[PDB]
Amino acid sequence: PGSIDAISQVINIAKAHPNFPIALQWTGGRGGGHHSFEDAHTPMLQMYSKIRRHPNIMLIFGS
Amino acid sequence: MIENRTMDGKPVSLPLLYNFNPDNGFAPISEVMEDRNQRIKEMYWKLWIDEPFNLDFDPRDVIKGKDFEITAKEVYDFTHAVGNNCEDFVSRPDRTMLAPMDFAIVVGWRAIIKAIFPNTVDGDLLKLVHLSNGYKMIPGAKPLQVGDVVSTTAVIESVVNQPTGKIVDVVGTLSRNGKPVMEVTSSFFYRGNYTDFENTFQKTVEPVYQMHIKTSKDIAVLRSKEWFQLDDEDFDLLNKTLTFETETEVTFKNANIFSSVKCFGPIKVELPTKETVEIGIVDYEAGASHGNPVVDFLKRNGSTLEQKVNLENPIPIAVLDSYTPSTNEPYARVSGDLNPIHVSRHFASYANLPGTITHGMFSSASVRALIENWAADSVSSRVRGYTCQFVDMVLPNTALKTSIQHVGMINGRKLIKFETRNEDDVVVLTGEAEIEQPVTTFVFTGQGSQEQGMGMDLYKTSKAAQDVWNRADNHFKDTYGFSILDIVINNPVNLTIHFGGEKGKRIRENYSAMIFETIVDGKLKTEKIFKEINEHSTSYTFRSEKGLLSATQFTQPALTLMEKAAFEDLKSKGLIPADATFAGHSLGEYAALASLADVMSIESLVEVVFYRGMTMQVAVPRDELGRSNYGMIAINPGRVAASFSQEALQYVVERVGKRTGWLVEIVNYNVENQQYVAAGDLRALDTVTNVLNFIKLQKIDIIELQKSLSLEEVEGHLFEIIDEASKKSAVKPRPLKLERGFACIPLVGISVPFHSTYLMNGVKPFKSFLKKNIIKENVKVARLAGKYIPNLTAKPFQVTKEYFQDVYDLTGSEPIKEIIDNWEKYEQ
Amino acid sequence: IAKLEGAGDLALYKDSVRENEIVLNNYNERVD
Amino acid sequence: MKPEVEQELAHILLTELLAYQFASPVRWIETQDVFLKDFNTERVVEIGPSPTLAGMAQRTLKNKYESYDAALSLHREILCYSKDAKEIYYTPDPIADEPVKASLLLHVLVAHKLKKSLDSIPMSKTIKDLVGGKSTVQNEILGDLGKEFGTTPEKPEETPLEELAETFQDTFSGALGKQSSSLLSRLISSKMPGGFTITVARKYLQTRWGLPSGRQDGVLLVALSNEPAARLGSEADAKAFLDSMA
Amino acid sequence: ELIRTTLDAEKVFTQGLNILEWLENPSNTPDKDYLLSIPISCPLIGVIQLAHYVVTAKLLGFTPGELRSYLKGATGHSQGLVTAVAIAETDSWESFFVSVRKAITVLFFIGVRCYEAYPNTSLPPSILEDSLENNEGVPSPMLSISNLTQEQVQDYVNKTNSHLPAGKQVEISLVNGAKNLVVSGPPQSLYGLNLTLRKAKAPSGLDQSRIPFSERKLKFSNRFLPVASPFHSHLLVPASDLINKDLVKNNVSFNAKDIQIPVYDTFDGSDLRVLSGSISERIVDCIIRLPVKWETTTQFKATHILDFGPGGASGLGV
C-alpha cells in the first residue's frame, strides 16, 4: 500500500481471511523506482496500532 | 407585619390595624383607613431613607441627597449582582475603573424615591408601580469613574391625577466637580382614585427649539404673538437663527382643563461668530386653558437641534437570553431597594402580586448590559442614553428573551430599540438606547480615479446629492457657461463656451479676470490665463484627446463634488458624528472643509477648485503642444533595498538637485518606507530612477557606508553615481518619455510639479482668489479646532501662537508674520 | 475556485483540478 | 481671546493653509500618525471614488501599529465609501422502486443526533466541524456510522459528509441495518401513530402515493429528521404528517 | 457554611450553593452560565469525582481505605490533584467526610480567589461571530491545539507574544500529548493566535494526496475549551498567596505520614509524599502557576488505570 487509505484496505483483507498470512510491505516515497508522495514514518505511527490488531498481518518495512 | 431584611438588621414592623365589630356579623372585620397611608410610608422610610422621618415638605421644592464617593468595592459588587461582565468595570493597571450608568440609581435612589413621600402626594406605597426608568448623559460629560464624589439633586417634574391613578415623574441630576453628569428619570404610579387637583402640577423644561427666519411673513407672525417680548423692539430678525430655551409650569383644576399655564425662557440669536446672545424673553401666562400655545407654535414653525431619521429597514442585532436570579436579595443589597415585595413572600401576598417579583431595575440593568455588549462593541462610554418601560412583572428563575434592533440614527448616534419576552411569549420590558458610533476620522481622496458617470448613481437616488450637483451645475452655467454634469455624464472631447448676449458678456468677464504668476527669466509676471479671450471674443474652445473629464480643471471640481455629495447624503441619513476628525489628501482638503466645517458654500467650493485646476495647468511652460518638461514618479524605498529608508531618499534626491541644478523634490509622504512621490524636471526624475536602478543591482547600502565608514566621502561616492546617469539623461529628446525601474513608477497624466517649491511663485493670485470666496463670517472655529488635520502642517488645526509660528517656518507669509509680531490681540 | 477568485491556497485548488483532468483523460481513453 | 478675533485669525490661518498647500509637500505619514495614534481612531471612512487612502491606512496600521493596537485592545475599521457602503449606511441584504442513497441516510443519522433540521446541516462540512465543542457527540456519531455502514475510513471526522457519503455508497446497498431500523422503531412507537405500527404505516404510503420498499424507507428517514416531538391526536393527523414527509 | 465564614463570598455566590435544591427541584436550578463559572464549578467537579469513588467503593462492599490499598498510586490533571491527595488519606466511612471536607474547602478557595484575580469579561461580538464561523469555539482563556508538536505550537506563540505586552502574553499551559496542547492567556490574545493558525492550516476539502509530503499544509484542530479561567498561567499568580492564607485560617494541611499511596505531582512527575515544604502550597502552585506535563506525570508503570473524572468517553481516561 502507498497511502493510509491503502493500509486500511489491507487490514480489511486480513480481517476477511483471519488465518491467511499477509505480508504488508510498507514503503515510503523515498524508495527507488515508482514511488508515492508519502513519508516513511508518519503513516506507520498513525496505522501501526490498527495493523497489530490483526495477528495474520506480518509487517515489513522497506525504502 | 415584619421585615427582617433592613438597613441595620434591627427588624422593621408595619402595624396594619383592623376594627372587629361583632354587631355586624356578615362582615365583622373592617380595615382602619385613617393614617393607613402614613403607617405604610413610615415603614418604607426606615427601609429606604437614612434621615429623621417627616412627610411635611413641599413637592415643588428641590430634594438633595448625600455626596456619594464611588469605590471599586461598590462597583465590583453592583456588576456581579446585575451580570455586567464588560472590561471597563474590572480593575486593571494604568486605565481607571469606570462605573456603569446603571450605577446612577444607586447614587440617586435616596433622593429620587424621597419625591413620592410628601403628605400632598398621598398613596398606598404597597400598590406603587415603577412604570419607566431612564438615563441620559449630558453631552460632552465623561462617564462615572471610581474616585469621583457625586452630588445628587432630584426634582418632581409632573404629579398628574389620571382616571386609573396618580403618575409621579421625577428627574434626578448627578453632578461631579460642580457640573451635571447625567439625568435619571423615573415615573411612578399610585393605583387609586385621586381628586387632589390642588396638589397636582407639571413643571417641565421643554427641548430647545430653533427658527430660521427666512421670509417677512415669518417675522410678521412672531410680532403678532404677545408672548415674544424683545429687549430692542426695532431689532432685525431677517436671515437670523433664533433658539427658544423655554420651561412651562402648569397647575390643574380638572383631569383635562389647566388652572394656569406659564411658558417662559430666554430667546437667543446666533451671531456671525456663532456665540449666542439673549435678545428676548417668552412671557406667556393664562387662566383656565386646554393647552400651551407657545410650544404648539415652536413645534410646527420651528425644529429641534437634533432630528432622528429611521433606517429604511430595521436591522436585527441579536436575540439574547438573560435569566433573572433565584433570589432578589443580592440586587437589593447593592441598590438599597429593600422594598419588601421583592424579598418577603408575605408582603408580596398582601400586595396581590404573583410571588416575590424581580426588581424592575434588575431587569433594566441586565438588558442594558446586553445592549452595551452587542451595540457598543462592549465600550461603556458609547451608551449615551437608555430608557426602559416596565410592562409586566417577572418572577425569579425566568428565561427572558430580548430582541435588539438598530432602528434609526440621530446626529451620529445609533437609535437602538429592544423588547424582552418571557417563556409564555409576553412583553415584560421595552426601551430605547442612544449609542455613539466608534471614534471616527473622515479622509477625502485627491486626484486619480476620474471615471465617466462618477457619483451619478448617488445623484439618481439621493435628494441631498441632487442639491449639491444641481447647485454647482447652475453656478458653473451662469459663471463659466458650461454644465459640470454634462462633462461628468458624457465626457466630451471638445467644449466651446460662447460669449453671446447679456449673460455671455458676464461669463466672458469671469474668464478675463483669472490671472496667474510665473517666473519669466527676470521677475514675477502677472498674466491672464486664457490669453486668447479678450472683449472682442465670442467663443472659447477647451480641447483634449481622450475626454475633458481627464483635464484637471474639470476633474478637480467633479472629484470634489462627488465627495461633497457622498458626504451630504451620509449627513442627511444622520450618520455623521459631531466630534469627527477629518483630513484630505491634496485636493481632498477642499471637499473635507466644505463638508465638515461649512467654510465655503457649494458655489464658492467649485469656483476655487476650478481656478486651482487652472493655475496647475499654466504654471509650467508647455510650448510644444499639451507636453511639458516636468512630471512625477512614485518611489517604493522598501523595494530598492531592505535598509533603504526615508533618510536615504531625503539625501539622494536633495543631492541630485544640489548637483545637477535641476529641480527635483519629494512632494507626497504617503506610506512610511513604502510610498513616496517625487516631482520635478523629467531629466532629474530620469537620474533618480537610474541612481535607484544602480543601488538595487550594486547593493551598496548608504547607511552602512555613510557616517559609519566614510565622512563627507558619501558626497564623493554619490556625485560619481549621479554624473554617469545625469549626463546620460541630458541627451534625450527635448520632451523625454520617462520609463520605470524596479523602485520607481511614473504617474501617467501628471505634467506639473504641484506640492513642490516650483509653484511657490503662483500663490499670490490663488491666495487673493480664496479671500473673495472664503468669507470670515462663514468660519466657525469650534468646527475646525482639534478636528481638521491640514497637509501643510500635519498638526490638528489650532488658533494659538505656536501653530502660526510653525506655519511661517514652512511658508514665509507676511500676513502671518505680522500677527505673531503683535500676538497681543488678547486685548480685543 | 469561483468563491476564492471572487476576491496561496488557490494555486493548490487549481493543480488539484489539473491533476483530476490527467486521471479523467485516462478514464475516457479507457471508455474509447 | 474674544470670539470675534479668534474667528478673524482662524480665517487668516485657514486661507494661508489652503493657499500654500499646493506649494509644500503633503505630509500624509505624519497625518495618519495623528489620527491613528493621538486620537485612537477606531474607524477611518475614506470618502472618494476609489479606495486609495484606505489601502494606505491598512498598510500603515500593519507596518507600525500591530504592537500599539494589541496593547490597547483597539479593534480598527478601514472603510471606503465606494466599496463598503453597506457597512457605512447600515443597510445589509438578508412509481419506480430505488434503494436509498448513503448520501440521504448519512445526512439523516447526523441530523437526528444533533437535534437539527435536514437542511440546517450542509453536506460540505466535517463531523468535527458540526459538533466541534462537545467531543462526546462526535464519537457517538462515529459509533452510529460504525453500526450503520460497518467499515469506516481513517479519521472520518476530518472528511466532509459529502465526500464521506461516496466512500460508503460503494460497499453499501440500500440497507437500513442496525442503527436506523432501531431509530424508526422508536420514532413510530414513542410518537403517537397511536395504534398503527410500521406495517400499517408502510402500506398507507404504498397504497395512497404508490411507493414500494426502497422509496418507502426514504420517506420514513425524512420523518425521523422532521420529528413531530409534540403529542398528535389521531391517524387523521399522522396521515397528514406522512403526506408532508413524502 | 463556607460562604458565611468567608468575608465577602455572598457577593460572588449570588444564587448560593444549595446543590440539594438544584438536583431535587431541577427548575429552581441556576442557569448554565453561572454553573460554569470557576467559583461554583471547581468545588462541584470535586463532588462528582468523590461521588464516583463512593458508588465505586460501596458496590464493591469496600470502605474507602480498602479501595486505596489496592491502588498502587493516584494522580490528577489540573484541579483533580486535590481529589487525588484526599483519596490517599481516607481510611473508614466516618473519617472519610473529614477528607472530603478538606478537598472541597481547598477547591472552594482556588475557585473564589482565582475569579477575583482574573475575571472573564465580555468579548466584542465581532470576535465571537468570527470564532463560531471558523469553527473555533466561543472564546475563553484556554485554547486546545490538536495535532501539532509542542515545538511547532511554541513557534506560533513566540510570533504572537512578540506584538503583546507582558501581562497579555499567552503560554503553553497543559502538554497533554506529544501532539495535544492547551494554551492559556487572555481570550483577546488567544484570538490573535487563532489568526496566525488560520494562515497555516489546510482547507478540509482539498485532497493533498498528490503533493510531496514536506510541502503539505499541516492538517490540525484548534478549539477554545469550555472553562472560564486561565489555569496554569502567570495571570493567576496574585491568587497563589491569598489561597495559602485561607487554608491556614480553615486549618487545612495535608501531611506526608497521613497519605498512604504515592500521589504524582503534575509538573515534575515525582511523589508529593517526598517534600520539604507544605503539600497544600505545592498542589495550589500546580493548578494556579505551573504547567501540566502529563507525559512525565503518567510515567508510572501499571496494567490498569481508573478514570473517576468527569466526561467519561470525552474525559481524561480516553
UniProtKB/Swiss-Prot annotation, chain C:
UniProt keyword annotation of Phosphoprotein present: yes
Portion held of the full protein: 53 to 101 of 150
Subcellular location: Cytoplasm; Nucleus
GO process terms (BP): fatty acid biosynthetic process; proteasome regulatory particle assembly
Assigned GO CC terms: cytoplasm; fatty acid synthase complex; nucleus
Name under which the protein is recorded: Translation machinery-associated protein 17
Gene name of the record: TMA17
Lineage: Eukaryota, Fungi, Dikarya, Ascomycota, Saccharomycotina
Keywords from the named record: Chaperone, Cytoplasm, Nucleus, Phosphoprotein
Role of this protein: ATPase-dedicated chaperone that assists the formation of the RPT6-RPT3 ATPase pair, an early step in proteasome assembly. Plays a key role in maintaining homeostatic proteasome levels and adjusting proteasome assembly when demands increase, such as during proteasome stresses. Function overlaps with RPN14.
Quaternary organization: Interacts with RPT6. Interacts with the 40S and 60S ribosomal subunits.
GO molecular function: enzyme activator activity; protein-macromolecule adaptor activity
Main location: cytoplasm
Swiss-Prot record, chain D:
Span of domain Carrier: 100-175
Processing and modification events after translation: 4'-phosphopantetheine is transferred from CoA to a specific serine of the Acyl carrier domain by the C-terminal PPT domain. This modification is essential for activity because fatty acids are bound in thioester linkage to the sulfhydryl of the prosthetic group.
Modified residues (O-(pantetheine 4'-phosphoryl)serine): 135
Per UniProt, location of the Glycyl lysine isopeptide (Lys-Gly) (interchain with G-Cter in ubiquitin) cross-link in this chain: 37
Cysteines joined through disulfide linkages: none
Residues modified as Phosphoserine: 50
Function in brief: Fatty acid synthetase catalyzes the formation of long-chain fatty acids from acetyl-CoA, malonyl-CoA and NADPH. The alpha subunit contains domains for: acyl carrier protein, 3-oxoacyl-[acyl-carrier-protein] reductase, and 3-oxoacyl-[acyl-carrier-protein] synthase. This subunit coordinates the binding of the six beta subunits to the enzyme complex.
Misc. comment: Present with 17000 molecules/cell in log phase SD medium.
Recorded family membership: Belongs to the thiolase-like superfamily. Fungal fatty acid synthetase subunit alpha family.
Subunit-level organization: [Alpha(6)beta(6)] hexamers of two multifunctional subunits (alpha and beta).
Identification of the protein by name: Fatty acid synthase subunit alpha
Shown segment, full-protein numbering: 1 to 291 of 1887
Curated annotation (Swiss-Prot), chain E:
Active site: 78 (for acetyltransferase activity)
Job description of the protein: Fatty acid synthetase catalyzes the formation of long-chain fatty acids from acetyl-CoA, malonyl-CoA and NADPH. The beta subunit contains domains for: [acyl-carrier-protein] acetyltransferase and malonyltransferase, S-acyl fatty acid synthase thioesterase, enoyl-[acyl-carrier-protein] reductase, and 3-hydroxypalmitoyl-[acyl-carrier-protein] dehydratase.
Further information: Present with 91800 molecules/cell in log phase SD medium.
Family per record: Belongs to the fungal fatty acid synthetase subunit beta family.
Subunit details: [Alpha(6)beta(6)] hexamers of two multifunctional subunits (alpha and beta).
Name this polypeptide is given: Fatty acid synthase subunit beta
Species the sequence originates in: Saccharomyces cerevisiae (strain ATCC 204508 / S288c)
Lineage, broadest ranks: Eukaryota, Fungi, Dikarya, Ascomycota, Saccharomycotina
Gene: FAS1
Whole sequence portion shown: 197 to 514 of 2051
